[PDB]
Write an enzyme that holds these catalytic residues in place. Structure first.
Site, PDB file in Angstrom:
ATOM      1  N   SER A  63       0.188  -9.670  -7.020  1.00 32.66           N
ATOM      2  CA  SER A  63       1.495 -10.311  -6.927  1.00 32.66           C
ATOM      3  C   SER A  63       2.016 -10.820  -8.266  1.00 32.66           C
ATOM      4  O   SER A  63       3.201 -11.161  -8.357  1.00 32.66           O
ATOM      5  CB  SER A  63       1.464 -11.445  -5.901  1.00 32.66           C
ATOM      6  N   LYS A  66       5.162  -9.297  -9.689  1.00 36.24           N
ATOM      7  CA  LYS A  66       6.496  -9.820  -9.412  1.00 36.24           C
ATOM      8  C   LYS A  66       7.112 -10.508 -10.622  1.00 36.24           C
ATOM      9  O   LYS A  66       8.342 -10.606 -10.706  1.00 36.24           O
ATOM     10  CB  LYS A  66       6.451 -10.789  -8.228  1.00 36.24           C
ATOM     11  N   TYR A 149       7.872 -16.180   1.644  1.00 38.05           N
ATOM     12  CA  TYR A 149       7.321 -15.279   0.640  1.00 38.05           C
ATOM     13  C   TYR A 149       7.178 -13.874   1.210  1.00 38.05           C
ATOM     14  O   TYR A 149       6.573 -13.679   2.267  1.00 38.05           O
ATOM     15  CB  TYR A 149       5.958 -15.814   0.195  1.00 38.05           C
ATOM     16  N   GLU A 271       6.648 -19.677 -10.264  1.00 39.90           N
ATOM     17  CA  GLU A 271       6.706 -20.929  -9.524  1.00 39.90           C
ATOM     18  C   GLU A 271       6.724 -22.068 -10.534  1.00 39.90           C
ATOM     19  O   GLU A 271       5.856 -22.141 -11.409  1.00 39.90           O
ATOM     20  CB  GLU A 271       5.496 -21.064  -8.599  1.00 39.90           C
ATOM     21  N   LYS A 308       1.602 -18.497 -11.466  1.00 33.85           N
ATOM     22  CA  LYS A 308       1.736 -17.491 -10.420  1.00 33.85           C
ATOM     23  C   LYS A 308       0.361 -16.915 -10.127  1.00 33.85           C
ATOM     24  O   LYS A 308      -0.363 -16.533 -11.052  1.00 33.85           O
ATOM     25  CB  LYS A 308       2.683 -16.365 -10.849  1.00 33.85           C
ATOM     26  N   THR A 309       0.005 -16.859  -8.849  1.00 28.95           N
ATOM     27  CA  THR A 309      -1.217 -16.206  -8.412  1.00 28.95           C
ATOM     28  C   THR A 309      -0.904 -14.777  -7.986  1.00 28.95           C
ATOM     29  O   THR A 309       0.207 -14.469  -7.551  1.00 28.95           O
ATOM     30  CB  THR A 309      -1.853 -16.960  -7.242  1.00 28.95           C
ATOM     31  N   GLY A 310      -1.897 -13.907  -8.124  1.00 32.25           N
ATOM     32  CA  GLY A 310      -1.745 -12.523  -7.724  1.00 32.25           C
ATOM     33  C   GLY A 310      -3.056 -11.931  -7.262  1.00 32.25           C
ATOM     34  O   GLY A 310      -4.108 -12.221  -7.839  1.00 32.25           O
ATOM     35  N   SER A 311      -3.017 -11.101  -6.222  1.00 34.28           N
ATOM     36  CA  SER A 311      -4.245 -10.563  -5.662  1.00 34.28           C
ATOM     37  C   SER A 311      -3.990  -9.191  -5.062  1.00 34.28           C
ATOM     38  O   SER A 311      -2.908  -8.910  -4.541  1.00 34.28           O
ATOM     39  CB  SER A 311      -4.822 -11.486  -4.579  1.00 34.28           C
TER      40      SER A 311
HETATM   41  B1  LIG Z   1       0.462 -11.342  -3.593  1.00 35.70           B
HETATM   42  O1  LIG Z   1      -0.764 -11.407  -4.144  1.00 35.70           O
HETATM   43  O2  LIG Z   1       0.828 -12.558  -3.149  1.00 35.70           O
HETATM   44  C1  LIG Z   1       0.476 -10.299  -2.411  1.00 35.70           C
HETATM   45  C2  LIG Z   1      -0.006 -10.957  -1.116  1.00 35.70           C
HETATM   46  N1  LIG Z   1      -1.458 -10.965  -1.065  1.00 35.70           N
HETATM   47  C3  LIG Z   1      -2.264 -10.005  -0.455  1.00 35.70           C
HETATM   48  C4  LIG Z   1      -3.586 -10.381  -0.633  1.00 35.70           C
HETATM   49  C5  LIG Z   1      -4.810  -9.621  -0.128  1.00 35.70           C
HETATM   50  O3  LIG Z   1      -4.688  -8.772   0.793  1.00 35.70           O
HETATM   51  O4  LIG Z   1      -5.940  -9.841  -0.637  1.00 35.70           O
HETATM   52  N2  LIG Z   1      -3.605 -11.565  -1.339  1.00 35.70           N
HETATM   53  N3  LIG Z   1      -2.278 -11.926  -1.607  1.00 35.70           N
HETATM   54  N4  LIG Z   1      -0.373  -9.170  -2.754  1.00 35.70           N
HETATM   55  C6  LIG Z   1      -0.209  -7.898  -2.073  1.00 35.70           C
HETATM   56  O5  LIG Z   1       0.617  -7.775  -1.232  1.00 35.70           O
HETATM   57  C7  LIG Z   1      -1.103  -6.713  -2.440  1.00 35.70           C
HETATM   58  S1  LIG Z   1      -2.506  -6.623  -1.291  1.00 35.70           S
HETATM   59  C8  LIG Z   1      -3.201  -4.945  -1.318  1.00 35.70           C
HETATM   60  N5  LIG Z   1      -4.449  -4.623  -1.774  1.00 35.70           N
HETATM   61  N6  LIG Z   1      -4.729  -3.241  -1.677  1.00 35.70           N
HETATM   62  C9  LIG Z   1      -3.762  -2.500  -1.173  1.00 35.70           C
HETATM   63  N7  LIG Z   1      -3.852  -1.063  -0.992  1.00 35.70           N
HETATM   64  S2  LIG Z   1      -2.351  -3.462  -0.750  1.00 35.70           S
END
Ligand SMILES: *[B]([O])([O])[C]([C]N1[C]=C(C([O])=O)N=N1)[N]C(=O)[C]SC1=NN=C([N])S1
Length: 355
Positions: A63, A66, A149, A271, A308-311
């Site tokens: 994320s 973004k 979100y 954020e 910002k966190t992302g995963s």
């Molecule tokens: B973002 O990081 O906020 C957003 C929401 N999210 C999903 C997760 C998770 O599933 O671990 N943590 N936060 N990130 C995403 O939408 C991408 S998640 C995906 N991982 N592999 C894929 N093929 S889609």
């Protein structure tokens, strides 16, 4: 310099135990203070290939992608390509005079359409299915009043920005945005010559995993980058005045708070919080209520900070910078760890570093 060893000790103290606590194969933590970069690498980029994490290792930002979508939006806006008061049907002609054409671009980028969840429906895969989804979209909550979100919300925003620049979104980042920020190895699509540097993610069972293609995945979560590039990106956010005006105005656009939900200010992608911010304030931005559920927004700070966190399924990312202190931190892991651990570790590091 002694500062090199002071930062190395603080990151070893706060971030290194996370590798053994959560069985993380590899990690890259970077700190930028007073225009000086400090890079710490731990563990393995790939378990099968036995490659150590290094300055060339490419991580999935999740994320955090973004933030580049918002930067591209601020770039197109200040070039006159878009206005944040325009609607998606002005650029995606098939959405003209549809219910989704009543939401403006700023509301899409800040998740206030009123009827867009965290993900697309599971059956929405192809481009025609994405178009059909937005054509069939109808409003629920009052537009602009509730923040939820949403990947599809900002994904449509990035799709519109690409249309206004007359180039695909992958080229918007790789040809215009990434070169303007001075990034060297940041990709929407990793070329074959860089696959040797593309780290593998690892799920909870320590199996290798790599992000899959998805509907509008690029503007939502499909950017990959290295630690030196992310430190350059934080430097660009810490010192926008040192960059050409086109990218300088784009960075400044992502720093303006648009509304507030409790103690959090929603900027473009970033954020925003009032500095100094308590640890609980930063942790509250990760709570289930803020991340997963709609919340009523409130109309609009001198001293600020941003994060910002992302995963992904196999990667964790966290970025944070404080303009007043001219300091920032980037965390990249090839295994997903709880967001609270990322925030706590970066909070203890940034507060213990000498001014
Ligand atoms: B973002 O990081 O906020 C957003 C929401 N999210 C999903 C997760 C998770 O599933 O671990 N943590 N936060 N990130 C995403 O939408 C991408 S998640 C995906 N991982 N592999 C894929 N093929 S889609």
């Amino acid at each position: 310099t002694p500062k090199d060893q002071e930062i190395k000790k603080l990151v070893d103290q706060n971030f290194k135990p996370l590798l053994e606590k959560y069985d993380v194969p590899g990690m890259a933590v970077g700190v930028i203070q007073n225009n000086k970069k400090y890079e710490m690498y731990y563990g393995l980029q790939s378990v099968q290939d036995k490659k150590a994490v290094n300055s060339s290792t490419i991580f999935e930002l999740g994320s955090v992608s973004k933030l580049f979508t918002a930067t591209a939006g601020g770039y197109a806006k200040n070039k006159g390509k878009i206005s944040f008061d325009d609607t998606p049907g002005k650029y995606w002609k098939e959405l003209k005079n549809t219910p989704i054409d009543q939401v403006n671009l700023l509301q899409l980028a800040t998740y206030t359409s009123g009827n867009l969840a965290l993900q697309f429906p599971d059956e929405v895969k192809t481009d025609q299915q994405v178009l059909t989804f937005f054509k069939d979209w109808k409003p629920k909550n009052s537009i602009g009043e509730y923040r939820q979100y949403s990947n599809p919300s900002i994904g449509l925003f990035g799709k519109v920005v690409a249309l206004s620049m007359n180039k695909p979104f992958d080229q918007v980042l790789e040809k215009t945005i990434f070169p303007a920020l001075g990034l060297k190895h940041s990709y929407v699509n990793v070329p074959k010559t860089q696959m040797q540097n593309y780290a593998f993610g690892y799920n909870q069972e320590n199996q290798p995993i790599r992000v899959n293609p998805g509907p509008l995945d690029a503007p939502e979560y499909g950017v990959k980058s290295t630690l030196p590039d992310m430190l350059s990106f934080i430097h660009a956010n810490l010192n926008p005045q040192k960059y050409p005006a086109d990218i300088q105005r784009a960075i400044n656009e992502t720093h303006q708070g648009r509304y507030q939900v409790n103690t959090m200010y929603q900027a473009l992608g970033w954020e925003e919080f009032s500095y100094p911010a308590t640890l609980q304030t930063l942790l509250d931005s990760n709570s289930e209520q803020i991340v997963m559920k709609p919340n009523k927004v409130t109309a609009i700070p001198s001293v600020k900070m941003y994060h910002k966190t992302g995963s992904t399924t196999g990667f964790g990312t966290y970025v944070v910078f404080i303009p007043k202190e001219n300091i920032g931190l980037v965390m990249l892991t090839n295994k997903r760890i709880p967001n609270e651990e990322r925030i706590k570790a970066a909070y203890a590091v940034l507060n213990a570093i000498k001014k």
